[PDB]
């Protein structure tokens, strides 16, 4: 049944809970971000509301093929009515078309759910400074001190520095990146832009792209693999056999394979810096991790949250589990504690 995490108290409003039949007593289904795990569920048979971001919409009338009638995108930081109720829709930081929802509810609590999202301190001059959130629906993914990681910025830096001197030392060199849902689009896109090259992909990948309103993305991808040199290729497929494989495939237009692998967080983060990360190679391929993460770190979370100063944190990650609950809990006090709330 439809866990009380994803129903959205003294309004009939759920978020993210496609996966359950009808859910008794819903009015109006809300979704996050377009990521499977959350629109698990949805398809052209669906025949209630939907209220998503423009992008997210684009995403489930050309992916999904969802009926245009059940689609209701919202603008971004604006006051909306939605079944009596006053919404707002606010930047998640998390992969495009990704929201948190503020719910101003009657009786005058307010409410945030954070769908996925990585906090940033640019958050806290949104709308959300401007009065009192009373209940958070957080994602804690990464809720424990060992997951750091480093910026955005940081990794990408990494990226296009090691792409653009494998190719200029070998110019027989192609650059792979793995993907297997939206978000993530700058590690490819910057690499690309360095090397003077579009990025080329499946006809599936590239629909998928088109529904993201990226500026002069006509400019920046293609269909045609042969004119460019980073490919974008399956997430599973980024593997020596995989691009072995795929190396044949170009008819020995190229001699040597630099791949990504953009990584959530892997264990060597606890140990190793950005500056000194190494690939795993097999000959003519190497296959690179990088912690490119669209989730907060724990000290990113912790801040977010102790800014914000909510009376009471709900979970939406890591709920399956006693010792993870209580784990959670521990930190938010912890955390509640040192800032006086
Ligand atoms: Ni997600």
Known sequence: TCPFYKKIPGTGFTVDAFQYGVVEGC???????????????????????????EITGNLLKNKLHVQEQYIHPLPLDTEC?????????????????????????????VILHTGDFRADPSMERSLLADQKVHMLYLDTTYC??????????????????????????????????????????????????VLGSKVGMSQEKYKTLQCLNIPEINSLIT???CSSLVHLLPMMQ??????????????????????????????????????????????????????????????????????????????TVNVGTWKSRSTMEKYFREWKLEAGY
Not at 30 to 50: E, I, M, N, Q, R
Not at 83 to 89: E, R
Request: aromatic share 14%; proline share 6%; glycine share 6%.
């Open 238 to 315: 980024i593997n020596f056999k995989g691009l072995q494989s795929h190396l044949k495939k170009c008819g020995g237009k190229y001699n040597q394979i630099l791949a990504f692998r953009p990584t959530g967080w892997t264990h060597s983060n606890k140990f190793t810096r950005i500056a000194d990360v190494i690939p795993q190679t097999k000959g003519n391929i190497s296959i690179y991790g990088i912690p490119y993460s669209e989730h907060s770190s724990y000290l990113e979370m912790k801040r977010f949250v102790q800014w914000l100063k909510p009376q009471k944190i709900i979970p």
């Open 223 to 225: 269909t045609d693999m």
């Open 81 to 109: 009515i939605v079944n009596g109720v006053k919404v707002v829709l606010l930047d998640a930081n998390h992969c495009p078309g990704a929201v948190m929802i503020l719910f101003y509810l009657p009786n005058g609590t």
């Open 27 to 53: 009015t109006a289904y809300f979704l996050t971000h377009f990521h499977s795990d959350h629109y698990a569920g949805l398809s052209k048979h669906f025949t209630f509301p939907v209220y998503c971001s």
């Open 144 to 193: 424990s001190p060992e997951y750091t990681f480093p910026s955005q910025q940081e990794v990408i830096r990494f990226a296009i520095n090691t792409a653009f001197e494998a190719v200029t030392l070998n110019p027989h060199a192609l650059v792979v990146c793995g993907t297997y849902s939206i978000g993530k689009e700058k590690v490819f896109l910057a690499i690309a832009d």
